[PDB]
Design a protein around this nucleic acid. Structure first.
Ligand SMILES: [K+]
Ligand SMILES: [K+]
Ligand SMILES: [K+]
Ligand SMILES: [K+]
Ligand SMILES: [K+]
Ligand SMILES: [K+]
Ligand SMILES: [K+]
Ligand SMILES: [K+]
Ligand SMILES: [K+]
Ligand SMILES: [K+]
Ligand SMILES: [K+]
Ligand SMILES: [K+]
Ligand SMILES: [K+]
Ligand SMILES: [K+]
Ligand SMILES: [K+]
Ligand SMILES: [K+]
Ligand SMILES: [K+]
Ligand SMILES: [K+]
Ligand SMILES: [K+]
Ligand SMILES: [K+]
Ligand SMILES: [K+]
Ligand SMILES: [K+]
Ligand SMILES: [K+]
Ligand SMILES: [K+]
Ligand SMILES: [K+]
Ligand SMILES: [K+]
Ligand SMILES: [K+]
Ligand SMILES: [K+]
Ligand SMILES: [K+]
Ligand SMILES: [K+]
Ligand SMILES: [K+]
Ligand SMILES: [K+]
Ligand SMILES: [K+]
Ligand SMILES: [Mg+2]
Ligand SMILES: [Mg+2]
Ligand SMILES: [Mg+2]
Ligand SMILES: [Mg+2]
Ligand SMILES: [Mg+2]
Ligand SMILES: [Mg+2]
Ligand SMILES: [Mg+2]
Ligand SMILES: [Mg+2]
Ligand SMILES: [Mg+2]
Ligand SMILES: [Mg+2]
Ligand SMILES: [Mg+2]
Ligand SMILES: [Mg+2]
Ligand SMILES: [Mg+2]
Ligand SMILES: [Mg+2]
Ligand SMILES: [Mg+2]
Ligand SMILES: [Mg+2]
Ligand SMILES: [Mg+2]
Ligand SMILES: [Mg+2]
Ligand SMILES: [Mg+2]
Ligand SMILES: [Mg+2]
Ligand SMILES: [Mg+2]
Ligand SMILES: [Mg+2]
Ligand SMILES: [Mg+2]
Ligand SMILES: [Mg+2]
Ligand SMILES: [Mg+2]
Ligand SMILES: [Mg+2]
Ligand SMILES: [Mg+2]
Ligand SMILES: [Mg+2]
Ligand SMILES: [Mg+2]
Ligand SMILES: [Mg+2]
Ligand SMILES: [Mg+2]
Ligand SMILES: [Mg+2]
Ligand SMILES: [Mg+2]
Ligand SMILES: [Mg+2]
Ligand SMILES: [Mg+2]
Ligand SMILES: [Mg+2]
Ligand SMILES: [Mg+2]
Ligand SMILES: [Mg+2]
Ligand SMILES: [Mg+2]
Ligand SMILES: [Mg+2]
Ligand SMILES: [Mg+2]
Ligand SMILES: [Mg+2]
Ligand SMILES: [Mg+2]
Ligand SMILES: [Mg+2]
Ligand SMILES: [Mg+2]
Ligand SMILES: [Mg+2]
Ligand SMILES: [Mg+2]
Ligand SMILES: [Mg+2]
Ligand SMILES: [Mg+2]
Ligand SMILES: [Mg+2]
Ligand SMILES: [Mg+2]
Ligand SMILES: [Mg+2]
Ligand SMILES: [Mg+2]
Ligand SMILES: [Mg+2]
Ligand SMILES: [Mg+2]
Ligand SMILES: [Mg+2]
Ligand SMILES: [Mg+2]
Ligand SMILES: [Mg+2]
Ligand SMILES: [Mg+2]
Ligand SMILES: [Mg+2]
Ligand SMILES: [Mg+2]
Ligand SMILES: [Mg+2]
Ligand SMILES: [Mg+2]
Ligand SMILES: [Mg+2]
Ligand SMILES: [Mg+2]
Ligand SMILES: [Mg+2]
Ligand SMILES: [Mg+2]
Ligand SMILES: [Mg+2]
Ligand SMILES: [Mg+2]
Ligand SMILES: [Mg+2]
Ligand SMILES: [Mg+2]
Ligand SMILES: [Mg+2]
Ligand SMILES: [Mg+2]
Ligand SMILES: [Mg+2]
Ligand SMILES: [Mg+2]
Ligand SMILES: [Mg+2]
Ligand SMILES: [Mg+2]
Ligand SMILES: [Mg+2]
Ligand SMILES: [Mg+2]
Ligand SMILES: [Mg+2]
Ligand SMILES: [Mg+2]
Ligand SMILES: [Mg+2]
Ligand SMILES: [Mg+2]
Ligand SMILES: [Mg+2]
Ligand SMILES: [Mg+2]
Ligand SMILES: [Mg+2]
Ligand SMILES: [Mg+2]
Ligand SMILES: [Mg+2]
Ligand SMILES: [Mg+2]
Ligand SMILES: [Mg+2]
Ligand SMILES: [Mg+2]
Ligand SMILES: [Mg+2]
Ligand SMILES: [Mg+2]
Ligand SMILES: [Mg+2]
Ligand SMILES: [Mg+2]
Ligand SMILES: [Mg+2]
Ligand SMILES: [Mg+2]
Ligand SMILES: [Mg+2]
Lengths: 254, 132
RNA sequence: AACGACUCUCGGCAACGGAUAUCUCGGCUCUCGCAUCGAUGAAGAACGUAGCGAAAUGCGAUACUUGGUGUGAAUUGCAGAAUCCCGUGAACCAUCGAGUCUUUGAACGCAAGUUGCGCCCGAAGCCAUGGCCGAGGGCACGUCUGCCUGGGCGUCACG
RNA sequence: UGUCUACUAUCCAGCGAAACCACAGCCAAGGGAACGGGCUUGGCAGAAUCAGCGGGGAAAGAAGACCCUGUUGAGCUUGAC
RNA sequence: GAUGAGUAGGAGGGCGCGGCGGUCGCUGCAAAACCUUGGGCGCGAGCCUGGGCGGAGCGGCCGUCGGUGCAGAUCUUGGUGGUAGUAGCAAAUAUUCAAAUGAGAACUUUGAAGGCCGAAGAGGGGAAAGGUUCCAUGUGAACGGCACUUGCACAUGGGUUAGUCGAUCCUAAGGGUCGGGGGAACCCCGACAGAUAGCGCGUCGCGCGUACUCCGAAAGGGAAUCGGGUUAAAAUUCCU
RNA sequence: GCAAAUCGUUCGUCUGACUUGGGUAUAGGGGCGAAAGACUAAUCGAACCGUCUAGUAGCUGGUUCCCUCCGAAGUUUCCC
RNA sequence: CCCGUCUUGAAACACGGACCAAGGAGUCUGACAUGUGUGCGAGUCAACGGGCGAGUAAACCCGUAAGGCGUAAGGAAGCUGAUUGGUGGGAUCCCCCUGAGGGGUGCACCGCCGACCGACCUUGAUCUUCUGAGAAGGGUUCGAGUGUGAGCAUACCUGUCG
RNA sequence: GCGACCCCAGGUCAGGCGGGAUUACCCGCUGAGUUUAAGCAUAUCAAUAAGCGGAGGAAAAGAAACUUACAAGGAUUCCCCUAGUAACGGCGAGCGAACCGGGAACAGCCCAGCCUUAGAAUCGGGCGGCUCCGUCGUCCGAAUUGUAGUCUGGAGAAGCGUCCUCAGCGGCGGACCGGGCCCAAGUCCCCUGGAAGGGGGCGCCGGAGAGGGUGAGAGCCCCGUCGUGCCCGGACCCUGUCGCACCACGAGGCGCUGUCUACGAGUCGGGUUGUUUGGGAAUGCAGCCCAAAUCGGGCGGUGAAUUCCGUCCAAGGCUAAAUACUGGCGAGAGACCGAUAGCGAACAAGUACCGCGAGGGAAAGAUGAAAAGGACUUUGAAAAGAGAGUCAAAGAGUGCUUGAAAUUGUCGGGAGGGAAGCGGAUGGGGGCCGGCGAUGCGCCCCGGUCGGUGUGGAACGGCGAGCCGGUCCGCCGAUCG
């Protein structure tokens, strides 16, 4: 999503400066000709010179973008989705889910009919997701450093992610004004929102319709996806990651 | 979040538009809230300050002072209020400029245009805010 | 070989200088929309123009603006204004359709280190058809269509 | 060789630069990049300051113009291509 | 349990700077930066903290990114020393006395005296070039390489009057051109390839008619002004 | 340095191939030269200005934090 | 003994450096290569473009005889195109035995020697459309070949080159 | 001599057209060298820079004298691929396209020539009228050395019959583009402060928590932002609907028909020369020489003859879209720069200044929330100082936020016989440090305070229906901790 930046191609070279050569008790750097102005006789064209040209000027045709293979991107999304169902990972990422009834958090499809932001907040309170939303608002602050003057004035913590499975649902606009709350359609889940900062354990609120579509969208270990042609969920190198059971099993301990 | 493609969220552009705004535009930018009594009467929240209006200062060291506007110095983004003055080192009296957003309009200088403006402001609120 | 001066050195304060930090109506880069200069005198250049201004910005002897429309009470550094307020109405306001737009410049009567050197038309006014006076305008080159006036035994026809 | 005059230098009031500067500034021998202000061994060595002086600082002024090297030129010449 | 040198060079683990995605915090009960003979930690890059100053922002941690770390380059720009109150002020003969003015006088003004330029001048004008430096009044600073009450500086205002003086007109070396001839075109030649410009006389007509009615001289050629008077500053220009 | 060519004294010529103002013609591999490679705006054995151009350089100079570990070569062959 | 530097050799009578602040030099990009991380795997790659979508430069989806690289090589070319392993060491495991032991197992890798495809050479029973087919049988020749695939995409360091 | 025509001349004749400017992209011409090849001349740099011209919102190209050799594609342009490939190259250094295939877009057409001859049926200008980007009337011209119709190879002319198709304007609305206006919620209580926009408390809006302003981090003070509603204007194109009109004479389509069936010249092509291209016995272009054809001509990537085959129809012209865009005008955005950075220029910057000229070309941003910009007293000729005053602050006093280093003065400590500094080791004198250094613990009784086995309830748990538990409340007993 980056926009290119580059210095002007002509910067530092809008000058007819030439070296004085040796024999005049000064360095051989090119110098501005003429007289009657402080600029006359000054160095030019040098990356070490005031008003000169920077070393290796930045160009617009830098390779800004990256194309990761589609299968790897699908692998990353599946891992992020799986991590969202582990309360330890969700807590480890900074989400306040102490009052959440259960993970994964699946709510009735009636939430998709909410039209007012006031009713949207009441829905969050009922399911116990409000404290995480309240955390995001209380973290509203001005960005330290030069970023604040770069049209990036404010920063805040991430709130819950709401996933809905009905196109055109009205909840997309009832929740959007709440700071930290993101809304995404199930058919087009985005990794940048599933693992913000490259950190697993995003707090996700699933609607019933969206939750029931996960098998169709991503398939299973046995049959392939219906919407990702020929895609199967990846397998781990270790069927059982519980070392204690393996190490303390009767077979090993014998 | 804004969605109008003709509207910019650039800090640089907003500041330039504010500080280079012509006198007619500065009139709207120099608006003050109506008093709770006038708000319930005309059903209007804000109004551009006028020369002959009466206002009350609600912020600053002159909080609580009440007086009549005597000059809308648009070039300086301030208004002058009768009796709201300080003394120079030489003893002379100079009016203190106050931003119109820091006062409350207690009485309006009504006229043919002012009354018509009040109707338009109330017309939208009476429909877009209540009937909806 | 004290004291004090000098030199060096450490600290406090005061100087010198403008680094650092925090800023930004600027720059840079990407993307998008639009197609609109000029002999109906352009771009550029010059001179002038405000109650107090040199520049920048604006304007053209109607000269930091006229007019229309919108907005609806200022402009402001000072002065001044029975200029203006329930309004044919303030503004160094916005906008544009009416109108003005000096000398130049492709620059066009000829020229130019010259406000130099010509010719033509002519309102108004005025003295008895004429004379003076005169606002304003005209007179480049190439070229197209048409037109007028002509030249050559160029090709003919008739006296 | 002596001497005379003027203007400087010299002293004062006022005014007031620049070249140059690694750090610095007493010597002898030694060794050392074979010619040291610094190192080794000795001579020695006493605040601050004035006018002169040209031994030394291999003094300053300039990336040696001489010579050589470069697969650098340029002016000129001819039986070079 | 053994073991420890290292230029050129290679590699590992770490420190520090500025963003971005996240996360955890600090701050007008005082952030950043900066200062300190405060204290402490790390082999070290560095880090933590007391006090002061300052008055509005900043930091830790994970990931990721880069115009990311200086003693040197006769490095760049800016600033500052020693040199040093030093080198230096010296051509064109020369000043002195009294008084006035002023806070202040070797340097301003008046008077007196003594000298110099000595008519191919240190005098009186003008052409180029400059452009208000001209004149009056006033003046804080700066400037006039000492000084200044001073002024070719600064501030305010004033000042250039033509039928006769010049430009203007004429042509010189030459310049710029029509047509024509060249030329991709910018351009080249320049009256040389051509139905010239028009003029004169009557009152529209007759006669004449050799391709430039152009530019080119404030010293060449050339219609006409002389005394006397007048301003702080103008005159063969104003007045008579 | 008064001065990026001046000052002092001393010298050459001084009715001529004399000196000088203004106007005008010749422009860069070109002009102009009683000829010194002189002169062509402090620039001339090829002016000045911008651009090509951040020209190329086997040659000179410099090349920015810390510890830890390993740790050289000046020899072979070929090469205007 | 003064740092930095070139040097066989610097405290040097070798060069740079009066002093301070700030600026100041292996970068970006294309190609290839080794290594490593990751995904998938005889495949791999959403790359032009399309469908859309955070009301959206992202993310998500699409390869239907698309294309790239790989899946087969040899030959200048006309062309032809892999009969599908033997052996000496060897990891691991199994049995006996408790030896520097003896059997079975024999991956990876290395050595050695055949076979197969192709260039070249050689060979020809038996057929055929006269120039081809191929029973058998070859070679101190040559190949960036075969003998149960290992590649493709992507990230980054280092190196060569523009 | 009078006339017509031809060619030419003059005109301040009536009415028109042209020049110049701009640079990002576009079209034509002209045209280097640095450089690379480790030298260098071909080559390369490059069909590029510089030079000279001409346009537009796009330009240019464009309806095959094509690709290809297949089961064939089908104007142009552009993207991916073809491919760093065929080819070219001191076959060195290097250089290098095209077709197929997949996509974006999609659009086709107009002339010249034999063909009115019972009628130049065409066009311009002057004048006049009307429903005025035009149309009608009239007059004078242009034109037969040919205007308009018909035709363009995909065809077509002519004849025949099938009996298919074809004739306008206006009203309203939508769509499209541009603008204008109104419209959510606190400025409630406490504390700090010069200022609340900060902290704490209590509320509210949210399809609006983009952004900015206001005396400190403001969703609710202000402008805006989200989403409706209302209003005005521009385009005359596209589209929906309504009303009126609606003559098939002619023309076209379809079918058949013996016949007819015209198509671009100093051009194609060839020789030669130069240049250019990947194009190699020669890719294109250009000069000169030669110079065509009509059952013919061009092409088919090796020159030539011979026999076939495939393919297209040059030498005339127009044409939207997909594509380009460091200029102009308007708009949005950013992991960009933050006053030695970023454009040379954040500011009266292409300015001041320099150069005869072509040209060269800087430095330079920040008082405070508000000038509240320092009255007055006293000293001095004045600048100014001293005291005082404004302010939260003059330790913010008109180049004033913060205010580092070099360097300088002063006060204080200390040292010094031709350097000083530096490493190591102590000492003297300073400065600094109470987490610089503790004061508890165990056992007794005096008092005070606070809780205590067995049965009842409350909310749960460990192990896997059932066992095994703790916590809290209450009631008894026990009488200690
Ligand atoms: K001292
Ligand atoms: K700064
Ligand atoms: K004009
Ligand atoms: K107006
Ligand atoms: K003249
Ligand atoms: K002195
Ligand atoms: K010696
Ligand atoms: K030379
Ligand atoms: K952070
Ligand atoms: K400290
Ligand atoms: K970081
Ligand atoms: K003169
Ligand atoms: K005259
Ligand atoms: K004259
Ligand atoms: K004469
Ligand atoms: K007179
Ligand atoms: K003489
Ligand atoms: K030359
Ligand atoms: K070499
Ligand atoms: K060196
Ligand atoms: K050396
Ligand atoms: K040295
Ligand atoms: K494939
Ligand atoms: K596809
Ligand atoms: K072969
Ligand atoms: K007509
Ligand atoms: K705000
Ligand atoms: K034809
Ligand atoms: K050729
Ligand atoms: K043919
Ligand atoms: K600059
Ligand atoms: K301050
Ligand atoms: K001190
Ligand atoms: Mg020197
Ligand atoms: Mg720069
Ligand atoms: Mg910072
Ligand atoms: Mg203006
Ligand atoms: Mg003219
Ligand atoms: Mg004139
Ligand atoms: Mg000695
Ligand atoms: Mg020495
Ligand atoms: Mg000694
Ligand atoms: Mg001594
Ligand atoms: Mg001497
Ligand atoms: Mg000496
Ligand atoms: Mg030296
Ligand atoms: Mg040398
Ligand atoms: Mg040299
Ligand atoms: Mg060389
Ligand atoms: Mg050599
Ligand atoms: Mg040479
Ligand atoms: Mg070691
Ligand atoms: Mg940081
Ligand atoms: Mg210190
Ligand atoms: Mg840190
Ligand atoms: Mg950066
Ligand atoms: Mg750098
Ligand atoms: Mg430095
Ligand atoms: Mg170094
Ligand atoms: Mg230096
Ligand atoms: Mg310097
Ligand atoms: Mg100095
Ligand atoms: Mg002296
Ligand atoms: Mg002297
Ligand atoms: Mg003297
Ligand atoms: Mg003298
Ligand atoms: Mg004197
Ligand atoms: Mg004399
Ligand atoms: Mg005399
Ligand atoms: Mg004389
Ligand atoms: Mg002086
Ligand atoms: Mg004077
Ligand atoms: Mg003056
Ligand atoms: Mg005269
Ligand atoms: Mg002449
Ligand atoms: Mg000419
Ligand atoms: Mg001509
Ligand atoms: Mg003639
Ligand atoms: Mg004349
Ligand atoms: Mg003349
Ligand atoms: Mg004369
Ligand atoms: Mg006079
Ligand atoms: Mg002198
Ligand atoms: Mg010539
Ligand atoms: Mg001579
Ligand atoms: Mg010679
Ligand atoms: Mg040059
Ligand atoms: Mg370089
Ligand atoms: Mg050789
Ligand atoms: Mg040596
Ligand atoms: Mg050394
Ligand atoms: Mg020596
Ligand atoms: Mg050297
Ligand atoms: Mg030096
Ligand atoms: Mg630095
Ligand atoms: Mg790899
Ligand atoms: Mg395929
Ligand atoms: Mg074969
Ligand atoms: Mg074989
Ligand atoms: Mg006319
Ligand atoms: Mg070479
Ligand atoms: Mg070379
Ligand atoms: Mg060479
Ligand atoms: Mg060019
Ligand atoms: Mg043009
Ligand atoms: Mg245009
Ligand atoms: Mg287009
Ligand atoms: Mg076109
Ligand atoms: Mg055709
Ligand atoms: Mg095609
Ligand atoms: Mg390939
Ligand atoms: Mg090429
Ligand atoms: Mg193509
Ligand atoms: Mg294609
Ligand atoms: Mg016809
Ligand atoms: Mg027909
Ligand atoms: Mg027909
Ligand atoms: Mg609150
Ligand atoms: Mg503040
Ligand atoms: Mg509001
Ligand atoms: Mg809206
Ligand atoms: Mg044709
Ligand atoms: Mg030919
Ligand atoms: Mg050519
Ligand atoms: Mg065309
Ligand atoms: Mg544009
Ligand atoms: Mg700058
Ligand atoms: Mg900075
Ligand atoms: Mg501040
Ligand atoms: Mg300050
Ligand atoms: Mg200091």
């Amino acid at each position: 999503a980056r926009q290119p930046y580059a210095v002007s191609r002509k910067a530092g070279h809008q000058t007819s400066a030439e070296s004085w050569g040796t024999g005049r008790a000064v360095s051989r750097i090119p110098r501005v000709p003429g007289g009657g102005t402080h600029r006359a006789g000054q160095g030019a064209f040098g990356n070490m010179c005031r008003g000169g040209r920077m070393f290796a000027p930045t160009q617009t045709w830098r390779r800004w973008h990256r194309k990761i293979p589609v299968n790897q991107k699908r692998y990353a999304v599946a891992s992020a989705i799986a991590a969202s169902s582990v309360p330890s990972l969700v807590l480890a990422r900074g989400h306040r889910i102490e009052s959440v009834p259960e993970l994964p958090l699946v709510v009735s499809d009636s939430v998709e009919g909410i039209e007012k932001t006031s009713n949207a907040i009441k829905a969050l309170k009922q399911i116990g997701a409000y404290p995480d939303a309240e955390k995001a608002k209380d973290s509203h602050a001005i960005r330290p450093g030069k970023g604040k003057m770069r049209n990036r004035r404010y920063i805040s913590r991430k709130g819950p992610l709401i996933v809905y499975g009905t196109e055109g649902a009205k909840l997309v606009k009832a929740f959007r004004n709440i700071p930290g709350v993101e809304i995404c359609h199930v058919d087009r889940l985005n990794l940048l929102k599933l693992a913000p900062g490259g950190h697993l354990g995003r707090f996700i609120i699933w609607t019933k319709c969206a939750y029931e579509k996960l098998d169709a969208i991503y398939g299973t270990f046995d049959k392939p996806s219906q919407e990702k042609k020929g895609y199967l969920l990846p397998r781990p190198k270790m069927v059982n990651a519980d070392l204690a059971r393996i190490i303390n099993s009767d077979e090993v301990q014998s | 979040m804004k969605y109008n493609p003709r509207v910019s969220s650039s800090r640089r552009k907003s500041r330039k538009a504010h500080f280079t705004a012509p006198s007619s535009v500065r009139r709207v930018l120099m608006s003050a809230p109506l008093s709770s009594e006038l708000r319930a009467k005309y059903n209007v929240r804000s109004m551009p300050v006028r020369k002959d209006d009466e206002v009350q200062v609600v912020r600053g060291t002159y909080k609580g002072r009440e007086g009549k506007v005597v000059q809308v110095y648009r070039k300086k983004w301030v208004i002058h209020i009768e009796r709201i003055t300080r003394e120079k080192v030489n003893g002379s009296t100079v009016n203190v400029g106050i931003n119109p957003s820091k006062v409350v309009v207690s009485k309006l200088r009504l006229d043919k245009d002012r009354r018509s403006l009040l109707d338009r402001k109330a017309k939208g609120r009476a429909a877009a805010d209540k009937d909806k």
